[PDB]
C-alpha cells in the first residue's frame, strides 16, 4: 500500500508532531473529545488525523478531493479509528452530504478548510452549534469568509485564525506553496519555464511566493492586481505591473492567486496566445471561470493528465490545469512535509487553547496566540539541534529605556 | 554650479514623488506659517526633502544625525536656498548637541526626528519646545522603541508617527533598499570578495533580513543570530544557518550588526575572532559593536584604510571595524537608492500634513502611518511610472465580502 | 487518440526545431536508404526525434537506454508509426542486452548511442555491424570517455562526434535544464523540504555545476566534493562550501552524485550517513552510488516510497536511495524540458547529416560537434522565436582583426 | 598616505602573493631580470610588482591611468626601487612616450595590459625585442591583438595568454568582474537597478557576469549580440535579446562589454530616454563613441564625479560614467582582492615558466600551462584550510578502461 508507507514516510519527517504525540499520547488530553474536519486528504493530513486521535480525540474526517474507492491512506485511517467519509467525484450533493454526516456526529472542535463545514453549522445545523465549543481554520479564504460571518453578528463560537499568525511567512514563501507550485505545473507539463512570461495575478503571501519562484527559475515575471500597495511592491521586487487584459496577450502562463472571483474574463481568455498554459493557486476553482472556457469552447481534449485542451472561436488552443482547480494540491504534493508540520502544530496546539479557554473566549475570530508561535518556533529548533542568543541583563534594560547609553 | 547645489541637482531629477507634491500644492502652501525642526543625515536626498517642504510653505529648520554625516557643501546650498540650517560637519559632541538646541529654540510646530532625540529633549530638558509642538514623525525603529519608552513613563505630550512601521517598510529595509546599500558601503571600503566568506547578521528584523538576502546574493555563506525563536525559524526556513554569536564568531569572516540592541559582541565575543575579521553595524546607534570595548582591549588601533580602523588584540590577532561602529550605509555609503528615499520622504510629507490636520484628535502615543497615506502614496507611484492596475468589479467587491 | 500518440502530440508542439528540420527536408529526404540505429530512454520526446529522423528518409530502429526506463505506450506509437521498435519496459537484464543485439542485427549505417553500448558492442563482439556503420553520434559524457579508452586501445573503426561537449552543453546542463529536472525528480519522489538542508554535490564538472545551482537557487546549503582542484576553487568561487566526502557524509540531508566515476560513496561513507538521509545519482551509470554495497550491508531493505528504497543499517540507522541508484532525472522523473531536447536533438539530427557527408574524411576518433553546427542550430533557435540581433560593420570587422 | 596603508591592506588579502615571496624570496630567482609592466596602477596592481621584486626581478612600470602628481601607492614603490613613469592626463602622447620608457630599460620578461607594450616593441624597437625573452598578456583585448599580430608572421618572442585559463570563469564572474561593474556604477549615480532596463552589449564572460549581476539586482536584462549562439545562451539564461536599434529606446542603462568598436550609434544615441546612463566595461574606450557624443551634444557638463551629462538635439540628456573608460577601474575599485590574487599567481607563474623555457618555446601565443592553473588551485585550496577527494585506485582503473563494471 503506497498509502500506508506514504503515511510511515511523513512521519518520520514531522518531527514537531511526532513530539507532540511523544509528549501527549500517556496523558490523552483530548480523551472524550470529537474532533471533526474538512480538509484535503492525503498523507499528510492523515498524520494530523492520527496525532489527535493519538491524543484521544475521536476523529472525524471528510475529504473535499474526490477519491478512489480503496484510497489507502482512507482505508489505514479507518483501521485507526479514524471515521472517513469520502467522495468519488466533483460533485456538490456528495460534498455537502459529506459535511452533515461530520457534523452528525457533533464534534467538540472543527478544523476547518475554508470555512465550509463552520458555515453550513451556522445555517443549516444549529443544534450542533451547542455543542460545538471552537473553530480551527487554516486559510486565507476560510479566515475571511468567517470575519464576515462574524461581521454581521451571526458567529456563535470561538474560532482561531490559524493563517494570520508570525509562520504565514513560511507557510507561503517561495520555499513553502511557491515551489509546490511550480513543481505541480512543471511535472504536468515539462515546459522549460525560463525566458517564458509568468503573469500571476494577485501579490498577496501566496502570489509573490510564486512570483519569487518563477523569477528564481529565470521567467519574465509580470503581476496583476487591485490594490495599489501591491504593485509598487512588485515592481521594487523588480516585477513588471500591468491590467490582466494586457498581461494576457503575451502570457506563456496565467497563475492565479488572488482568492477572488473571475480574475480572467472571456475577452481575457480569447487573448490567449496559442499554447498558453492556465492555472490557479486560489482556494476555489473560481478564478478561473472554467465554466466560461466549457461554454466558448469549440472543443475540449485531454492533453495530458491533468492538462486540458480548449480550443477557441479564434482557432487557438489553451491549456488548463487540473481543471481550475488549487494546482499544487490537485496535480502535486501540496507543501513540503516539514512546511505541514509546523502548520499542523499550529493547529493541534488552537485546538488545545480552544479546549482550555472556550468558556472565556468569545464568538468571534482570534489571530493565533502569540504564545502558540513562540511554542512551536522553540520546538522547531530543539529538533533541528538549534541554538540562539538571549538578551543579557544590560541589554534588557537598554530595550525599554529612552535614554541614551551615552 | 557648486558642487552641493550639483549634487542636489542629480537627485531631483530622479525623485518624482517629491516633485509630485511640490506641484501638487504649489498654489495651496500648506504648511505656510508653520515650522518643521528636521535632525537627519544632511546629504542631498534629506536636502530635497527640506527643499520640498520648503515650497509647500514651511519655515525648516534643520541639523544632522550626526555632525560627522553632515555635507557642508549641501548645507551651504540649502542656505543659499533660504533654509536655516545649524549644522557643520564636526566631531565635536558638545557642538552637535548644541546644534539639536539651536533646531529647538525655533520652536517647531512639527519635527521629523531621526532617532528620537529632538523628541526625547523637548519632552525632558527643554519643556518650552511644548508651547508650540503639536507632532512628531520619527523615521527609525530605534527612535519608536525610544519613543514608546518614553510614552511608557508618562512624559510623551505630542502625537508620534512610525513611518518606519507601514506596509511600505518591506520597499526601505529591501534587500534592494538597505540591503545593498550597507553591501555597498562594505565593499567599497574593503574592496573584499563576498562570495564564499561566512557572513554573520545579528537580527532578522525588516533590515537585518534585507542585509542577509543581499549577502546570499554575493555568494556569502549566511549564519544569522537572534534571541528571538520566531525569527530565528524565520531565517532557518529562508535558508540560512542559525547559530549563538559565541559560535558564529569563531569562523566569521564579517559580523553586521542589525538588531537595535546594544553590546551584540561581548569582549569574549571579540577576542573569538580571527585575524582579518570585519565588523559593521547597520543599526541606528553606534552601541551594537562595543567601540569603547575595542579601545580598551586593544594593544594598538590605527587606521588601516579611509574608514576601517584596525585594532591589534591581547591574542596577537588584528579584526577591523568600519566607520567607527557607525550606521555603515550612511558614514561610509551613499545611504539609501535616489528613487527609495523619494517614496520614504513622500510618505513622511504627507504623514507631516496628516498630524497638521488631525493632531488635535491624536493621543500623546505612538501611531503607525495611516493606511491611506500607504494607498495615496503608491498611486501616486504608479501613476508617476504609468502603470495601470485592474480594479474590481460589482460582483468580485459582492464575492469578497460574502461568506455565503 | 491512445497515450502514446497523445504524449507524443503534447511533445510536437512544443519543438519548432525539429518541426522545422522535418519542412526543411521534406522533399530531399537526406537519409533515404539509410538505417539509423538508437539506444535511448524511450518516451515522447525521444520518439519525436525517431519521428523526425524516419520523415528525412531514415529507416530508424530504437532501443532502450535501459527496459526500465522504456515507456510501452510510446514503444506502441511508434510501431504504428512505421517505426521499428525493440524494446519492452523489462527488469531482465539478459531481454535488454538481447534488444541491443536486434538493433546492430539491423546493420545501421549510424547510431546514435547513449553511453556508448551499442558502439562498444559493435567493435568488439559484433564486428559484422563494421561492414556498414559509417559513424556514431554518442550524447553522454560518460559514453564519450568509454569511446575514447575504445579509441586508445586501436579497437575504434568509425569517426565519433560528441555531441555532448559543444558550446551549448551550457544549455544541456544548465541550472535549468539538467539541474531543474533533477530537482524535481528529488522533490516529487520525496516532498522534503530543500531550503536549509545541506546538499552534498559529488562532482563539480557541468551537470554537477547545473545541480548545485539549482540546490543554492531552491535555498539549500551546498556542499561539493571533487578530486580535481581547479574544479574545487571554482566550486568555492560560486559560493559554495567544499570538503571530503567523508567529512560530508556526517552532516548530509541529500547526496547527489554527478562525477561520471564509480563508487563515489564508501561503505564507511555510508556507515557514517545520519538516519534519514537521501541519496540519489545524477551520474549515467548506477554505480556511483554502490547499490551492491548497500543491499549486502543492510538489516533491512524496504520500499519507503514509489522510487524510494530504505537500506536499514547496523548501526540503526535507516538511508534512503532514489530510482535504485540509477540516472534521477530520468530514472524517476520527466528527463529534461521539452525545449531543451528540442534544441539538443537538431544537434544529434545534423550531427548524424554531417556524418552522412563527411564521415569518409574523418578517422576513427572522438570528435566535437563542428561549430558550424551550433551556428546553423542557433539561428534556427532565434529564427523560431522571432529573434533579431545584431550584425557586425566593415569598421568592426576591421578592428576587431586589427593589431595596430 | 592611503597609498602606504591601501598597499598594507592589500597584502593581509592576497594569501597567494604572500606565499610566493614567502617561498622564493630567498632564492630569488628573477634575480638579474628585468620585468616591465604596463598595467592599471594601484594598490593591487603595486602588490603584483612588489612580489617580483621580492623575488629579484628589477621592475619598470608605467601606469595607464592618470596619477596625481605625488601618488602615494607611486611613490611606495618607488621607495622599494621599482620604477614607476606616470602621466597626469589622458594625453595619448604621453602615453606613448612612457611605454617607450619601459622598453629603454631592456625588460627581458613583459606583463602587457591590452598588447600595447608588445605590438611597439614589434613596431619601433626592434633592438629591444632581441633581449626581450617573453610576454604574459592578461587581457582578452590584448590576446586578440597579439594572435593577430602572430597571424602575420610578424610576431618575434613567445606570448602566454594567461586570459584564457580554466579560471578567467573566476576573473570574469559575477562576484568578479559583475559585481566590481555594478558597485562602480551605483557608487557614482545612487540609482535604484531593481526594476530598470539593463542593456548589456555583448554575452562573452565580461557581459554574462555584468548581466547576471544586474538580473540578482533586480533588472530586467537585454542583452545585444553578434553571435547567434551567445544570443541563445543569453534567452536560456532568461533575459531578453534584441537588436541594440530597439534596446536603446527603453534602456535605463547601456553597459558595452564587447570589446568591439562603436557599439553605439549616433542614431542609437538619439533614441535613448531622458536620464538613460552610459557606462563601458570593454578594454577600450571606443565601445560608447565618446568623440560622437562630444560632436552632438548640444551641451556637455559634469553631473556627479565620474558622470557626464550630454543635453542633445532633441533636449534629451543622458549621462556618461567615467567618460566611457573601463568602468570598474577607472570608477571603482577593479576587481576583488582576492579575485586580483588569484589572477596575479597565475600571471607570476606564467613568467616563471617563462624564465624557465623561453629558449624551447616558440614566438607564438600559448595558452597558460594546465599545470600552472593546478598549481594555484592547489595553492588556493591550501590557504583557505580547504581539503578535497582523491581517486582511488579502483576509480584510476574505471575511468581508463570502455568495458562495463558489469
Ligand atoms: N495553493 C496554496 O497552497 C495556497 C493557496 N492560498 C489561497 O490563495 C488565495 C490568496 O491567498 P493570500 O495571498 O494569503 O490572500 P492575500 O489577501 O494575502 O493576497 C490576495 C491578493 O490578491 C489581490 N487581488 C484580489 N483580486 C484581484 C484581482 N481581480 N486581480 C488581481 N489581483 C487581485 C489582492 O489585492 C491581494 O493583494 C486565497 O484563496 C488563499 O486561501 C493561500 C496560501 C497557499
Ligand atoms: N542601516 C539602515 O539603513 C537601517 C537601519 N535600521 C536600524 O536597524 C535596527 C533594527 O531595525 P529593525 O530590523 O526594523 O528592528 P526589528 O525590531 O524589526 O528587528 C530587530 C531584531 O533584532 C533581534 N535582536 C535583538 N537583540 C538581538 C541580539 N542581541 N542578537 C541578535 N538579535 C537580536 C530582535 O529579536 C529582532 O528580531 C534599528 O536600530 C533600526 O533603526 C533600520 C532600517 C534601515
Ligand atoms: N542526469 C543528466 O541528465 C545528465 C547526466 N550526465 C552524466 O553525469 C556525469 C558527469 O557529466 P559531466 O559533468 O559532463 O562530466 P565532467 O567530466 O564535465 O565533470 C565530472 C567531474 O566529476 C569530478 N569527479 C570525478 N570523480 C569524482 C569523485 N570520486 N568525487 C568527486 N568528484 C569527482 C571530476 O573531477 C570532474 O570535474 C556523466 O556520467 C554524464 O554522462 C551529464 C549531463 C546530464
Ligand atoms: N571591465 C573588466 O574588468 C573586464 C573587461 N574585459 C574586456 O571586455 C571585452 C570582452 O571580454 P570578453 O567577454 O572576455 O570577450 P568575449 O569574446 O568572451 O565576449 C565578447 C562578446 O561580444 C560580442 N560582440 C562583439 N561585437 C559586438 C557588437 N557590436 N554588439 C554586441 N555584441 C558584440 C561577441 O559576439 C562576443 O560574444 C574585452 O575588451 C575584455 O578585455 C574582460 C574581462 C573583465
Ligand atoms: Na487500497
Ligand atoms: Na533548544
Ligand atoms: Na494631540
Ligand atoms: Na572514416
Ligand atoms: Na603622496
Ligand atoms: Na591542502
Redesign the interface.
Known amino acids: 500500500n503506497?498509502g500506508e508507507?506514504?503515511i510511515?514516510?511523513v512521519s518520520?519527517?514531522m518531527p514537531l508532531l511526532n513530539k507532540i504525540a511523544e509528549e501527549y499520547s500517556r496523558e490523552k488530553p483530548l480523551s472524550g473529545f470529537t474532533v471533526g474536519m474538512s480538509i484535503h486528504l492525503e498523507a499528510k493530513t492523515a498524520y494530523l488525523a492520527i496525532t489527535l486521535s493519538k491524543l484521544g480525540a475521536k476523529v472525524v474526517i471528510t475529504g473535499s478531493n474526490p477519491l478512489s474507492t480503496q484510497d489507502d491512506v482512507a482505508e489505514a485511517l479507518r483501521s485507526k479509528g479514524i471515521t472517513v467519509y469520502a467522495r468519488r467525484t466533483h460533485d456538490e450533493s456528495i460534498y455537502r452530504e459529506n459535511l452533515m454526516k461530520v457534523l452528525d456526529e457533533r464534534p467538540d472542535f472543527i478544523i476547518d478548510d475554508g470555512?465550509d463545514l463552520t458555515?453550513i453549522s451556522h445555517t443549516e445545523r444549529e443544534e450542533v452549534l451547542e455543542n460545538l465549543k471552537g473553530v480551527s481554520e487554516e486559510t486565507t479564504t476560510g479566515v475571511?469568509?468567517?470575519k464576515?460571518?462574524e461581521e454581521?453578528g451571526k458567529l456563535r463560537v470561538p474560532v482561531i485564525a490559524v493563517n494570520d499568525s508570525?509562520?504565514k511567512?513560511?507557510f507561503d514563501?517561495r520555499?513553502?506553496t511557491g515551489?509546490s507550485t511550480w513543481?505541480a505545473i512543471?511535472?504536468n507539463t515539462?515546459?522549460?519555464?525560463?525566458?517564458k512570461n509568468v503573469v500571476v495575478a494577485g501579490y498577496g503571501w501566496c502570489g509573490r511566493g510564486i512570483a519569487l519562484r518563477a523569477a528564481?527559475?529565470?521567467?519574465?515575471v509580470i503581476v496583476?492586481?487591485?490594490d495599489?500597495?501591491k504593485?509598487?511592491?512588485a515592481?521594487?521586487?523588480?516585477?513588471?505591473?500591468?491590467?490582466?487584459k494586457?498581461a494576457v496577450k503575451i502570457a506563456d502562463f496565467v497563475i492565479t492567486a488572488s482568492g477572488?472571483?473571475?480574475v480572467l474574463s472571456k475577452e481575457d481568455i480569447l487573448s490567449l496566445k496559442d499554447?498558453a498554459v492556465l492555472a490557479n493557486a486560489g482556494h476555489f476553482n473560481?478564478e478561473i471561470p472554467v465554466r466560461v472556457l466549457e461554454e466558448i469552447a469549440v472543443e475540449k481534449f485531454?492533453?495530458?493528465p491533468n492538462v486540458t485542451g480548449y480550443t477557441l472561436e479564434n482557432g487557438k488552443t489553451v491549456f488548463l490545469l487540473a481543471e481550475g482547480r488549487l494546482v499544487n494540491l490537485a496535480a502535486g504534493?501540496?507543501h513540503?512535509?516539514?512546511?505541514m508540520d509546523l502548520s499542523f502544530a499550529l493547529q493541534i496546539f488552537a485546538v488545545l487553547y480552544l479546549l482550555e479557554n472556550h468558556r472565556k473566549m468569545s464568538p468571534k475570530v482570534y489571530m493565533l496566540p502569540d504564545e502558540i508561535?513562540?511554542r512551536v518556533?522553540?520546538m522547531?529548533?530543539d529538533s533541528?539541534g538549534?541554538?540562539?542568543?538571549?538578551?543579557?541583563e544590560?541589554?534588557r534594560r537598554?530595550?525599554?529605556?529612552?535614554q541614551?547609553?551615552h
Do not use: C
Open positions: 503506497t508507507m506514504k510511515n514516510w518520520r519527517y470555512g458555515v475571511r469568509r468567517l464576515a460571518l454581521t508570525k509562520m511567512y513560511l514563501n520555499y513553502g515551489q513543481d512543471m511535472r515539462n515546459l522549460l519555464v525560463a525566458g528564481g527559475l529565470g521567467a519574465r496583476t492586481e487591485v495599489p500597495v504593485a509598487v511592491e515592481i521594487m521586487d523588480g516585477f513588471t505591473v500591468m491590467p490582466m494586457e477572488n472571483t473571475d499554447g473560481v485531454e492533453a495530458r504534493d501540496g513540503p512535509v516539514e512546511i508561535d513562540e518556533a522553540r522547531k529548533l533541528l538549534v541554538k540562539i542568543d538571549e538578551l543579557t544590560k541589554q537598554y530595550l525599554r529605556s529612552w541614551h547609553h
